[PDB]
Design an enzyme around this catalytic site. Structure first.
Site, mmCIF file in Angstrom:
data_model
loop_
_atom_site.group_PDB
_atom_site.id
_atom_site.type_symbol
_atom_site.label_atom_id
_atom_site.label_comp_id
_atom_site.label_asym_id
_atom_site.label_seq_id
_atom_site.Cartn_x
_atom_site.Cartn_y
_atom_site.Cartn_z
ATOM 1 N N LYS A 1 0.858 -1.258 -0.008
ATOM 2 C CA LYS A 1 -0.086 0.163 -0.101
ATOM 3 C C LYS A 1 0.706 1.052 0.002
ATOM 4 N N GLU B 1 2.786 6.333 10.597
ATOM 5 C CA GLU B 1 3.540 5.627 9.447
ATOM 6 C C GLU B 1 4.800 5.124 10.399
ATOM 7 N N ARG B 2 5.611 4.100 9.831
ATOM 8 C CA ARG B 2 6.761 3.341 10.403
ATOM 9 C C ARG B 2 7.709 4.528 10.256
#
Lengths: 501, 187, 469, 50, 100, 470
Positions: free
Chosen positions: C157, C183-184
Site C-alpha cells: 500500500k 507511519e513506520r
C-alpha cells in the site's frame, strides 16, 4: 451599500427578553449539552443557547434536560444560559422551495435568496389515516423499462432501493427524477409530480455534482433539494428526513402530487445511533437504538395517496438503503424491508456483468403490484415475468452445462435476448410510449431470433423505424394507453416488418 | 412532603431530614444546630478537614461521631440520628453537601427568594435598592419569599447586567448584545 | 489565558484538570503543562462541570504527578503556515522535527477550522492520468479529486502511494503536502531521504513540498491531531496561496483508530465493533476539510488500512462513503502476484463515464469488466471440474481473461528494487489501444507468461520474441 | 461580475473589522459606565411592567 | 449514590425519626419496589436462601438473590397483584412439594 | 379514587416516568390518562420504582410533553369497550373508533390484560376446518377452533393469503370474526377497509359480521405492543359472553414480538438473544394461552408471522413455531416457481393430520403425495448434474408425476381476481382427495404439465387439458 441596509435591519432588532426559563450548562461535551433548569420545557423543543447555538431537546430528566446541540460545542462553554424558543422545531414550507437547495433549518445553501415560504410546519406530523386514504391508481413512470415492467411505481407507494454501496446508487434514483421531466415540463397538473431529493450524509462535493447534473438536464426547475451534508450536525441529520417530510406535505396538502426520494436512510440510522448513545440511552440491537424501527416507520408512513375527499393528494416515497456487504439480515436493513411496500434489489454481480441498471429480479418485488402499471404496458409485458422466471431456472441448469434440450434452449435463447433488451444507458431514461413497442417485440418473440450482439443495434434502429413509419402508432400508444385490437395488429405488423430490418 | 424536591443524590437524605424534622415540628432548631456543628466541623481544621475523607473504619467512623456529639450537646436528636445515618452509610463526603441542601429546603420552608444580579462590576447601592424594589414590585415576588440580591462580578460578561431569580432571568448584558450584533453583522 | 489548575486525574492520556478560578477555557482550547519534559500540549474536549474540564493529551503523560500546575494556552493549537513550511517535517505541535530550527512564521492558524461551505464548492472534471495502466483503464483520476486505496498498509500500500508521488508530483509541480499519520518511522526516513534525492525537497534550495509526519510510536492522542494539523497546512496553500496543491494521507484508518482509542477513555458508550460514536462526525468533518473549493483544487490521496481486510468493518465502510474514487487492492490479487494488486472488479471512479473519457474508452472498459466478471463467475466450475469441461465458447473467454489478468501487471519503477524489473509508464492513449487489441484477440496467440509482469502491448510483442528464444 | 460580487463581500469583511475596532472603542469609554446605567434603568422600567 | 434501602426515603425517614427495624424487617419484610416480577424487599433478615416467602397479595415467591439490604424475591404469581410496601410474611419453608 | 395527580419526571422515550402523589399508591398494569391538547395520552403503569415514582409506557406520542403536568389515574388496565356494538367499526388501541362511526355504544368494557383460562376450563375438541384451498386441504388440513399459523416471508402475498381465508372461510362461517392488524401499513389497511366493505362483511348501514382493530406501524412501539391484547379482549367477549364461535385473525405477529423487544430495551432490561426481550417466551405465551377453545366458546385464530429473512431458526419465529397448533409455511421458492399459493408442501405440518382424524383414505393419499414430492426433491440434485436420463425408469415416471402434482397444487385465489384476474376456486375436501388420488394412480399421465397449472378439481384438470390440446 447593501451593508447600510443590513446594519439598519440589525439595529432594528432590539427589545428585551423576559427569559421565562433559563438553565445553566454544566455537562457539555461531545456536542451533546445537558443543562440544569428549564422547568417549563416542551419535548422536542428548540432551545437557543446563549452563544448563537440552537439545539433541540430530546431528553427531559428530573435533573438535567439534555439538549442536543445543532452546532459545534466550540462555541458553547460551561454555565451558559439557554432560552427556550418556545416553538417545537419547524421549517418554512412553500412553493419557493422549488429550485432551491436548502439546509435543514431552511437556509438556502445555494444562496438563491430567502425562501419564498407559504407557511411553516412542524417536523413530526401524524401519518394519513385509513379513512383519509384512497387506493393507488396513478402510475409513475421512471423511464427505466425494467423498473416500469417489473416493479411498477405508483403514487403513495414506498419502495425500497436496496443494494451495495454507491453502485451508482444515487444514479438509480436520479434516473427516476429525470424521466419526470416529460410530464413535469407538460402542463398536466394531474401528472405533475414535484420532486424532492433528500440527501443525507453525503459530502458537499457529491451534492454539488448532483445539483449540477440536475441543472444540466434542466430539471432543477421542478426539484427541491433538501441536503444535510456530512459536516452538518448529527442532530441536524436526524432531523433532516423529518423536515423533508413536512416540505413534501405542503405539496401533498395542496393535492399536488409529488415524490420524495430519501437517499440514504442508512446514514440516518448512524446519526440516530450517535445521538442516542450520547443521550446515554441504553444501546439497542446492533448498537442502533431500539426505537429506530419506530423512527423510520413514522417517517415512511407519511407518503400516501390521500382520499378523493382529500383531493386525491399524493406524496410518493422512495427510500434508499445501502446494504453493507449486501447483508440483508442486518437490523437496519431488516427493519426497513418490513416497512416498505417494495424491494428494488440492486445486485453488484449483475452490475459487473454489465446489466446496468442492475436488478436481481428475484430479490425485487412490488407488493403494490401492477395496479399502478400502465394498462398497455401490462398487456405487453404479460409473460415477460414468466419468461424471465423461466430464464432464471434454465440458467441455473445451464451452469452444469449438461446437453440442454431444445425446450430449455428456447428459453435460454429467448432469455439472453431479453436481458440485453432490459439494459439502458445511465443518465438517459427512455419514454414509456416508446418502451411499449420494445417489450412487444421481445414478448412476441421477434427478437428471440435476432442475434444477441446486434440486439443493441436493433433496439436503436427499431425506435428510428417506428419514428419514421409508425409514429402514428406511437402517438396512439401515448394517447390511448391501452393497446386495442387495432393497435395490437398495427404493432404486430410493424414489428414483423422490421424483423429483417 | 418537602417544599419542592430538589437534589436526588444526597438530597433524598436532605428531604428525609426535612420531613422528619417537620414531624419533629422544629426544623429551624434542627437547621440552626446543624449549622452550628457544621461550622465547628469546618472550624476544626485538623481532621475536621483531613478526616472528611473516608479511609478509616465503620467503628472508627462511629468514634469520630461520638467525638462530634461531645463537641455540641445541642444538635437535637434527629440530626444526631442524621449523624448515625451518615456514619452507617459511611459517607462523610456529603455532610456539608447535605448541610447546604438542608439550608435550601429550610429557607424554602422559611420562604426566602434567592437571586443574583451578576454584572461586570459591583453596582451602585442605589442600583441595588432600585432593583430590590423592582423585584419585590414584580409578580416574581409572591410576598411570601423575599429575594436575595447577590452581586457577582463577571467582566467576561462585558458590561450590562443580568438579573436572575426563579427560573426567570433578564439578560441585558453588553456582551450578549455585542455578540448578537456581531453575529447578525457577519450575516 | 493564564488559568491555573491542578491535575485531578491522569486516566491514560486523558488528563483532567480542575481550574480553581471561575474563568474556564472553552472546548477545543489548548493547555500546556510545563514539566522537565518541556510543555505537554493538551486540548479541552469535555467540560465536566464544577470547574473541571477533561482534556485529551497530545503528548505522552508518563511521569505526571497529580495536582500538577497547568496553564491554559487558550484556543485551538496554532500551527505555523506559510511557504516556509515547505522544507520542514513538523510534529503535531508544529515543532520542526527535521531540526532546521525555528520555522519562519507568517500566520499561525488554529488546527480546527470549519469546512468550507456548499456555496464554496467547485466540482472537478479534470483527467489526471498516472500512467499506471490499471488506474488508467479502470478508473481515471482527476485533479482535485479524493483518491482511495484499501488493503494491508505498507504491504504494498505504501509502495503504491510512492509510485503515485513519483509520477504525479513532478508533473504537477507547485505546492504539495505529505502528511503521514502513524507511519513506520524508518519508512518515513526513507521517504525523507528519497524526496531530498529527487530534489522535490531541495534543502539547499527551496522545496515545493512540505511534510508532516506522525510516527506510529507517537501516543494515540497525538496521532489523532496529526491529521488536523496537516489539513491546516493544506488550507493555507488552498486558500491563502490559492495555488493547486497535492495531499497524501496515510493511513486515514489511523485517524479513525486513534479516535476509537481515546473514545473509550473519554467515557463514551462503545458503538459497534468498538468504534467511537463520533466516528461518523469526525470522519465527515475531516473529509469535508479536504475539498476543491473555487479558491483552490487539492488532489488528495487517502490510504485505508482495512483491519483484517474486511471491508464490512464500520470504519472502512464509512471511509468508502467519503471518497471520490477508490481502487481497492486485494490480498487475493496480491497472492496472484499481480503488482499493482488493485482488484479490478472493486474499483470505481465517477470519472469513468462515456462522456468523461469518451465512448471508446468506456467501451474498452466495459468489455474488460464483462470478461473478468465471467472469469470470476466460472471460478467455482473451474475448481470443481477442469477447464476442458467448460463450453468451448467459454474457454475462449477464460483464455482471454487469463491473459487480461496477466496483462494488467505493470512493473513500477519505485518498486524496481522489489520487482527487479525496470518500471514503465504507459500513456493513457496507449493504454486504451493496448487493451483494445487484446480484447479483439489480436495478440492472443502468445503465452500467458508473455503477458506476465510486463508493460504495454508493444512490450508484450517483444517479450514474446524474448520467450520464443 | 465575479470580481464585483467578490468586492462586495470583501467590503463587508473589511467593514467587519472596523466593527471590532468600534467595539473596543465603546467598551473603553465611560459609555461603559453610562450605558450600564441606561440598561439598569431600562430593566427597572421593564421588570416593573411585569 | 449506592443502592441502599437508605436511598428509600421512607425507610430513611424512619431512621432519622429514630424508629428501629424491630423484627418486622428481621422476620417479615416489606417490599421496597416491585418491577419485572422481582420484588426487592427490605427486611427478611431471617430468610434462608431460596426459601419460599408469601406476599400479602397471596403471591408466593422464592428468594434467589439475597443481597445486603434487599432480598430479591421472584414472584411465582403475576406482577399485577403485587405492589410496593406490601407485607411479605416469611413462609419459612424452602421449596418443597408433596412426594408419596 | 380521588384522582392521583402525577407530575411527569422524565420524558425519555415511550418510557415516561410519573411521580404520583405521596401516600396514595398506583398499581401495576394500571392506566394513567394525561389530558393533552390532543386527546388523553394513555400511559400504562409498568413498574413501581418507589417514592411513588412509577415508570410507565406510552400508548400515544410523547412529543411536546412538559416535564411535570397533572396526570390523572383512571386505574387498572386499559379498558376497551366490548359489545356486539363493537362489530362494524375500526377501533384503535386506546379503544376509540377511528372510523368515526360515532362513539361505540358500550355495554361493557373489559381490561386489556386478562388471565389465560385454567387447565380445567380448557377442553379442546378436534374438529376439521375446511379451507377450500387445495394445498391446504390435502397437505395440512386446518382444524376448527385451532391455532392456525401462517408462517411466511414479508408480505409475500401474506396479506393476500389471509384475505383469501377471510373471503372463503369468514364469509362461510357463522361465527363472528375479528380482524386485528398489529403494526401494518395504512395502504394495506385502507385496502382491507375498502375490500371488506366491498365483500360486504362490513355493511356500513347494514350489519357487520366482523369488527376491526387496526393498529398501524405509525404508532409508538408501546402502542404497537398492546394492539394484540386489545383485539383479544374483544374475542374473549365474543367467546364467552356472546357465547358464539369466533374466527380470530391477527396480523403480523412478528410485529408483536418486535414491538415488545423495543419497549423491553426501553424498560431497561438487559437485551436477550438476538436482541429479543428476555420476557419473550412468557409474553408470547400469554397471548397464545389466552386464545383457546373453552367450554364457553371456540375461537379459531389465524395468526400471520413474518419470518425475518426467511430464517425460521431466528428466535422470534422459532418461539412462535411451538406455540401455534397448525403451522403452514409459505416459502419464497414456491412463490418464485410461480405457484401461488406459496405454501411449502413438504414443510406444512398440522396437529390434525393423524390418520384416524382425517380418515384413512385422506391420510393414505396425502402420504403418497408427501413421498412423491420428497423423492422429487431428492432426485432434483441428481437431475441437476447428471440429468434426468441417468435416473431409473420408475424414477422418471415419479418425476413426471411430481412435476404434474407440483402444478396441480396451484389454484387461483378469489382475492386474486384483482392480482391475476383469474376466477377463484373453492374445491370440496372430498373432491380434492379424490382428484389427487386419480393423479397419483396416474390416471392423468396422458395430461400435460401446464394443464394442471391453476386448475381446480378433476373436472378442471381434464377441461384445461382439452383447451390446451386445441
Amino acid at each position: 451599500e447593501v451593508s447600510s441596509i443590513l446594519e439598519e435591519r440589525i439595529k432594528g432588532v432590539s427589545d428585551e427578553a423576559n427569559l421565562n426559563e433559563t438553565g445553566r450548562v454544566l455537562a457539555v461535551g461531545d456536542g451533546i449539552a445537558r443543562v440544569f433548569g428549564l422547568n417549563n420545557i416542551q419535548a422536542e423543543e428548540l432551545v437557543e443557547f446563549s452563544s448563537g447555538v440552537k439545539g433541540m431537546a430530546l431528553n427531559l430528566e428530573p435533573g438535567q434536560v439534555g439538549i442536543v446541540l445543532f452546532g459545534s460545542d466550540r462555541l458553547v462553554k460551561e454555565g451558559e444560559l439557554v432560552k427556550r424558543t418556545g416553538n417545537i422545531v419547524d421549517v418554512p414550507v412553500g412553493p419557493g422551495l422549488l429550485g432551491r437547495v436548502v439546509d435543514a433549518l431552511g437556509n438556502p445553501i445555494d444562496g438563491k435568496g430567502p425562501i419564498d415560504a407559504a407557511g411553516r410546519s412542524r417536523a413530526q406530523v401524524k401519518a394519513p389515516g385509513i379513512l383519509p386514504r384512497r387506493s393507488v391508481h396513478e402510475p409513475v413512470q421512471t423511464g427505466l423499462k425494467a423498473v416500469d415492467a417489473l416493479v411498477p411505481i405508483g403514487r403513495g407507494q414506498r419502495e425500497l432501493i436496496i443494494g451495495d454501496r454507491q453502485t451508482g446508487k444515487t444514479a438509480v434514483a436520479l434516473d427516476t427524477i429525470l424521466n419526470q421531466k416529460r410530464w413535469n415540463n407538460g402542463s398536466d397538473e394531474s401528472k405533475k409530480l414535484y420532486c424532492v431529493y433528500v440527501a443525507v450524509g453525503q459530502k458537499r462535493s457529491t451534492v454539488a455534482q448532483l445539483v449540477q447534473t440536475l441543472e444540466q438536464h434542466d430539471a432543477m426547475k421542478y426539484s427541491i433539494i433538501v441536503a444535510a451534508t456530512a459536516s452538518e450536525a448529527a442532530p441536524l441529520q436526524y432531523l433532516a428526513p423529518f423536515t423533508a417530510a413536512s416540505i413534501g406535505e405542503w405539496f401533498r396538502d395542496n393535492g399536488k402530487h409529488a415524490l420524495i426520494v430519501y437517499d440514504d436512510l442508512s446514514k440516518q440510522a448512524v446519526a440516530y445511533r450517535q445521538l442516542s448513545l450520547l443521550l446515554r440511552r441504553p444501546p439497542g440491537r446492533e448498537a442502533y437504538p431500539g426505537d429506530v424501527f419506530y423512527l423510520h416507520s413514522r417517517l415512511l408512513e407519511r407518503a400516501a395517496k390521500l382520499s378523493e375527499k382529500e383531493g386525491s393528494g399524493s406524496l410518493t416515497a422512495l427510500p434508499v438503503i445501502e446494504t453493507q456487504g449486501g447483508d440483508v439480515s442486518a437490523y437496519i436493513p431488516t427493519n426497513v424491508i418490513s416497512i416498505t411496500d417494495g424491494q428494488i434489489f440492486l445486485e453488484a454481480e449483475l452490475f459487473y456483468k454489465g446489466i446496468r441498471p442492475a436488478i436481481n429480479v428475484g430479490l425485487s418485488v412490488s407488493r403494490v403490484g401492477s395496479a399502478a402499471q400502465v394498462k398497455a404496458l401490462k398487456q405487453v409485458a404479460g409473460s415477460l415475468k414468466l419468461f424471465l422466471a423461466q430464464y432464471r431456472e434454465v440458467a441455473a441448469f445451464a451452469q452444469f452445462g449438461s446437453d440442454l434440450d431444445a425446450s430449455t434452449k428456447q428459453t435460454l435463447v429467448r432469455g439472453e435476448r431479453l436481458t440485453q433488451l432490459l439494459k439502458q444507458n445511465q443518465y438517459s431514461p427512455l419514454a414509456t410510449e416508446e418502451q411499449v413497442p420494445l417489450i412487444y417485440a421481445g414478448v412476441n418473440g421477434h427478437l428471440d431470433g435476432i442475434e444477441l450482439s446486434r440486439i443493441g443495434e436493433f433496439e436503436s434502429s427499431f425506435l428510428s423505424y417506428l419514428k419514421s413509419n409508425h409514429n402514428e402508432l406511437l402517438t396512439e400508444i401515448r394517447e390511448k394507453g391501452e393497446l386495442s385490437k387495432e393497435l395490437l395488429a398495427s404493432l404486430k405488423s410493424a414489428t414483423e416488418s422490421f424483423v429483417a430490418t | 412532603p418537602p417544599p419542592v424536591r430538589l437534589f436526588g443524590v444526597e438530597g433524598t437524605y436532605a428531604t428525609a431530614l426535612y420531613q422528619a424534622a417537620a414531624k419533629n415540628s422544629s426544623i429551624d432548631a434542627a437547621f440552626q444546630s446543624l449549622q452550628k456543628v457544621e461550622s465547628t466541623v469546618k472550624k476544626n481544621p485538623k481532621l475536621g478537614h483531613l478526616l472528611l475523607n473516608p479511609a478509616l473504619s465503620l467503628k472508627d467512623r462511629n468514634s469520630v461521631i461520638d467525638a462530634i456529639v461531645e463537641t455540641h450537646k445541642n444538635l437535637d436528636g434527629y440530626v444526631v440520628n442524621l449523624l448515625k445515618v451518615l456514619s452507617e452509610n459511611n459517607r462523610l463526603g456529603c455532610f456539608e453537601k447535605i448541610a447546604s441542601d438542608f439550608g435550601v429546603l429550610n429557607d424554602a420552608h422559611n420562604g426566602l427568594l434567592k437571586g443574583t444580579v451578576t454584572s461586570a462590576e459591583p453596582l451602585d447601592p442605589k442600583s441595588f435598592k432600585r432593583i430590590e424594589k423592582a423585584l419585590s414590585a414584580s409578580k416574581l415576588v409572591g410576598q411570601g419569599k423575599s429575594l436575595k440580591l447577590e452581586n457577582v462580578v463577571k467582566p467576561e460578561i462585558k458590561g450590562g447586567l443580568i438579573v436572575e431569580l426563579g427560573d426567570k432571568t433578564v439578560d441585558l448584558s453588553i456582551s450578549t448584545k455585542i455578540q448578537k450584533l456581531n453575529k447578525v453583522l457577519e450575516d | 489565558t493564564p488559568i491555573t489548575g491542578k491535575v485531578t486525574a491522569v486516566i491514560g492520556a486523558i488528563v483532567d484538570v480542575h481550574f480553581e478560578q471561575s474563568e474556564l477555557p472553552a472546548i477545543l482550547n489548548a493547555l500546556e503543562i510545563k514539566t522537565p519534559q518541556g510543555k505537554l500540549v493538551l486540548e479541552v474536549a469535555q467540560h465536566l462541570g464544577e470547574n473541571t474540564v477533561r482534556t485529551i493529551a497530545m503528548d505522552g503523560t508518563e511521569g505526571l504527578v497529580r495536582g500538577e500546575k497547568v496553564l491554559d494556552t487558550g484556543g485551538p493549537i496554532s500551527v505555523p503556515v506559510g511557504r516556509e513550511t515547505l522544507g520542514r517535517i513538523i510534529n503535531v505541535i508544529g515543532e520542526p522535527i527535521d531540526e532546521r530550527g525555528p520555522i519562519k512564521s507568517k500566520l499561525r492558524k488554529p488546527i480546527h477550522a470549519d469546512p468550507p461551505s456548499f456555496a464554496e464548492q467547485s466540482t472537478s472534471a479534470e483527467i489526471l492520468e498516472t500512467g499506471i495502466k490499471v488506474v488508467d483503464l479502470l478508473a481515471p483520476y482527476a485533479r482535485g479529486g479524493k483518491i482511495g486505496l484499501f488493503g494491508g498498509a505498507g504491504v504494498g500500500k505504501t509502495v503504491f502511494i510512492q509510485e503515485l508521488i513519483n509520477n504525479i508530483a513532478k508533473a504537477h509541480g507547485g505546492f504539495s503536502v505529505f502528511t503521514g499519520v502513524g507511519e513506520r518511522t524508518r519508512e518515513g526516513n526513507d521517504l525523507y531521504r528519497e524526496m531530498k534525492e529527487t530534489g522535490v525537497i531541495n534543502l539547499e534550495g527551496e522545496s515545493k513540498v512540505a511534510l508532516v509526519f506522525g510516527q506510529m510510536n507517537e501516543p494515540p492522542g497525538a496521532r489523532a491531531r496529526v491529521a488536523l494539523t496537516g489539513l491546516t497546512i493544506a488550507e493555507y496553500f488552498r486558500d491563502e496561496e490559492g495555488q493547486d496543491v497535492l495531499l497524501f494521507i496515510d493511513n486515514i484508518f489511523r485517524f479513525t483508530q486513534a479516535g476509537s482509542e481515546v473514545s473509550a477513555l473519554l467515557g463514551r458508550i462503545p458503538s459497534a465493533v468498538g468504534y467511537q460514536p463520533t466516528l461518523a462526525t469526525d470522519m465527515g468533518l475531516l473529509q469535508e476539510r479536504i475539498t476543491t473549493t473555487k479558491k483552490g483544487s487539492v488532489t488528495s490521496v487517502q490510504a485505508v488500512y482495512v483491519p483484517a481486510d474486511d471491508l464490512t468493518d464500520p470504519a472502512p465502510a464509512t471511509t468508502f462513503a467519503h471518497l471520490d474514487a477508490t481502487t481497492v487492492l486485494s490480498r487475493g490479487i496480491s497472492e496472484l502476484g499481480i503488482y499493482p494488486a488493485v482488484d479490478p472488479l472493486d474499483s470505481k471512479s465517477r470519472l469513468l463515464d462515456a462522456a468523461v473519457v469518451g465512448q471508446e474508452h468506456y467501451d474498452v472498459a466495459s468489455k474488460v469488466q464483462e470478461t473478468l466478471q465471467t472469469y470470476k463467475s466460472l471460478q467455482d466450475i473451474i475448481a470443481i471440474l477442469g477447464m476442458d469441461e467448460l463450453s468451448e465458447q467459454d474457454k475462449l473467454t477464460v483464455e482471454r481473461a487469463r491473459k487480461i489478468q496477466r496483462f494488467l501487471s505493470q512493473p513500477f519503477a519505485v518498486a524496481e528494487v522489489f520487482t527487479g524489473i525496470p518500471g514503465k509508464l504507459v500513456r493513457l492513449k496507449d493504454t486504451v489501444a493496448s487493451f483494445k487489441a487484446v480484447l479483439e484477440g489480436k495478440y492472443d496467440n502468445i503465452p500467458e507468461h508473455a503477458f506476465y509482469m510486463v508493460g504495454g502491448i508493444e512490450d508484450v510483442v517483444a517479450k514474446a520474441e524474448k520467450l520464443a528464444a | 461580475v465575479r470580481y464585483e460580487a467578490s468586492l462586495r463581500q470583501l467590503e463587508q469583511r473589511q467593514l467587519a473589522k472596523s466593527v471590532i475596532s468600534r467595539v473596543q472603542s465603546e467598551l473603553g469609554n465611560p459609555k461603559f459606565q453610562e450605558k450600564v446605567l441606561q440598561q439598569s434603568i431600562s430593566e427597572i422600567e421593564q421588570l416593573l411592567s411585569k | 449514590t449506592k443502592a441502599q434501602p437508605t436511598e428509600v426515603s421512607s425507610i430513611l425517614e424512619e431512621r432519622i425519626k429514630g424508629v428501629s427495624d424491630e423484627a418486622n424487617l428481621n422476620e417479615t419484610g416489606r417490599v421496597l419496589a416491585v418491577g419485572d416480577g422481582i420484588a426487592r424487599v427490605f427486611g427478611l433478615n431471617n430468610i434462608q436462601a431460596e426459601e419460599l416467602v408469601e406476599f400479602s397479595s397471596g403471591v408466593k415467591g422464592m428468594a434467589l438473590n439475597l443481597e445486603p439490604g434487599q432480598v430479591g424475591i421472584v414472584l411465582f404469581g403475576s406482577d399485577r397483584l403485587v405492589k410496593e410496601g406490601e407485607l411479605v410474611k416469611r413462609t419459612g419453608n424452602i421449596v418443597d412439594v408433596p412426594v408419596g
